[PDB]
Amino acid sequence: MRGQIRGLEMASKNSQDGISLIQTAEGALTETRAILQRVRELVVQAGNTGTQDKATDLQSIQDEISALTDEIDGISNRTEFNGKKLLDGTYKVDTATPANQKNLVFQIGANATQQISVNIEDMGADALGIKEADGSIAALHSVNDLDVTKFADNAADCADIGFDAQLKVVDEAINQVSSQRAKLGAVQNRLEHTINNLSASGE
Amino acid sequence: MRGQIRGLEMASKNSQDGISLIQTAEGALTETRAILQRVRELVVQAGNTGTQDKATDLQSIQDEISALTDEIDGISNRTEFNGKKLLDGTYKVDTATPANQ
Amino acid sequence: NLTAAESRIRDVDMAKEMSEFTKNNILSQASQAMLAQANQQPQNVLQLLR
Amino acid sequence: NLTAAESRIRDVDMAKEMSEFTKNNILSQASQAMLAQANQQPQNVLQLLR
Amino acid sequence: NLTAAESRIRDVDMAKEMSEFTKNNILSQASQAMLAQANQQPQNVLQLLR
Amino acid sequence: INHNIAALNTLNRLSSNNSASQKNMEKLSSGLRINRAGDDAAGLAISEK
Amino acid sequence: INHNIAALNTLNRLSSNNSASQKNMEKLSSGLRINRAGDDAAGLAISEK
Amino acid sequence: INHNIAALNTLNRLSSNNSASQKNMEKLSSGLRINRAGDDAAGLAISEK
């Protein structure tokens, strides 16, 4: 009994610790979401300034956007909880090889297998993900915007220099971040629920 | 007499122990009930967002719900009183075969 | 967040720890009373001698 | 209109939430008082020993 | 309205329940005093032996 | 008369009073009369619904 | 009866009430009910969009 | 629970609100939303031109 009791309280501590890890990652992704919001604003504004302003001004917009990218990588790589750099692709959700997923095992209960799995990925190349991001598309859209001159070259009828494609893929990156944050919120709800059961059982 | 006396007090201890087992299971089911409450909320909200929001957003709601499911299984399988995993179907109320209840 | 984890390791929950303080004291007081009872047997041994 | 919906998801109704704050506090204070009553039984146990 | 009914099932009237808390405690204290009186008869039995 | 004193109604009523006081706190610290399904099973189910 | 008192539902309900009050402030100081993705994950995603 | 209180989301949201109010005045006293290049870098460059 005692074994499982003290082990159970320790498991609850472990769970709260997992929650706070999620708090750090969640804050990083919150800020990432603010960045991507600003990016989308610049994409829309770039969209009209395919008429209004020149490749010089579009290049200024690109300066800002590229800086914002560099910050996204900066979040992905500086973000550490007790040194744990998470947002990097080390903890990809599902590699081609399941052996290389590097899944995250939080211990949750006192006994064997009373644990879970967690994964995460966001970085510069977090645009639309097929299995890789893609080649000329779905990677730069987060990393290197097309907002250099290429909107002055053509409207949305190209899909590689088209405005619609651009805006779409940005919105999809947003949907991946939003999805990740949503999952994490669910997970910490799960954890808290469990911690209630752990403390109860402990009593 | 003595036989039945000490046996009787032991039986009362045994009964209290059974109660506390029930306390553990009851707490697990309390939490399960909170989960299911949240689920129902998401179902209602999903109901109106059959108009308001898209299959992407419904898919986000599904992400949360699926997580909550996975927690229900997590309760059913992590819940143990001195190692006794109860909520599992091992102790089904009434199998087709009464021998396997 | 790190502050929270730090505290969970470092900061004691002084409610529970107060209860443990209470408990350990009363166990000490009780224990002493048990000594005061323990050391009275020999004097009735003396009553057998006297 | 979208601002309204945004707020209805995001913006808390701080009136109700204030009332919940009030409530949760007083439940905490009451709970502590119940601890202060809980931890006084053992000392009358001592009175049985002493 | 449903909140009201919910509460009437769920929410305890902590005034009355406080009074019941008071009562049950004092019954415990009294009971213990009755034990302290109960366990003093045997020692006058000893006075008959001694 | 002392191998087994008769003052066990004393102790049983004592454990009962202490049990009651415990339950009282369990209600007051939480603020519920249904903190546990044995308090009121029927009303629990209803309240759920 | 005092090696391990039974007044731990007390402390657990206490940590729960204090947890709640904390969350309350986290909402009020910010002015949000979605200050954290565990408050409302679904509505968070929606609100994002 | 008091060696390190958990009421730091309080202070962080406070410094954030005060930061915002500062920025608000910086805009209002000047009458600009581009008083500083971090407000809007892109629109700053454009506005320059």
Residue numbers in the entry:
A (entry chain W): 52 to 254
B (entry chain g): 52 to 152
C (entry chain M), D (entry chain A), E (entry chain K): 255 to 304
F (entry chain K), G (entry chain A), H (entry chain J): 3 to 51
Article, verbatim:
There are three parts to the flagellar structure: the trans-membrane basal body that functions as the motor, the connecting rod and hook, and the flagellar filament that acts like a helical propeller. Our current understanding of supercoiling in bacterial flagellar filaments, referred to as polymorphic switching, is based upon the notion that protofilaments within the flagellar filament can exist in two discrete states, that differ slightly in length. To reconstruct filaments at high resolution, all protofilaments must be “locked” into the same state, either L- or R-type, producing straightened filaments that lead to non-motile bacteria.
While the three L-type mutants (E115G, S285P, and S17P) have a left-handed 11-start helix, the four R-type mutants (N226Y, A233V, H84R and A39VN133H) have a right-handed 11-start helix, and the designations L and R correspond to the hand of these 11-start helices. The first atomic filament model (R-type H84R) was built de novo using an established Rosetta protocol, and the other filament models were built by RosettaCM32 using the H84R model as the starting template. Similarly, residue H84 in B. subtilis is not conserved in terms of sequence and subunit-subunit interactions. In the R-type mutation H84R, the R84 side chain in subunit S0 forms new hydrogen bonds with the S229 side chain in subunit S0 and the E50 side chain in subunit S+11, enhancing the R-type interaction. As a result, the H84R filaments adopt a right-handed form. We also identified several straight mutations that are only involved in the 11-start interactions: S17P, H84R and A39V in the double mutants.
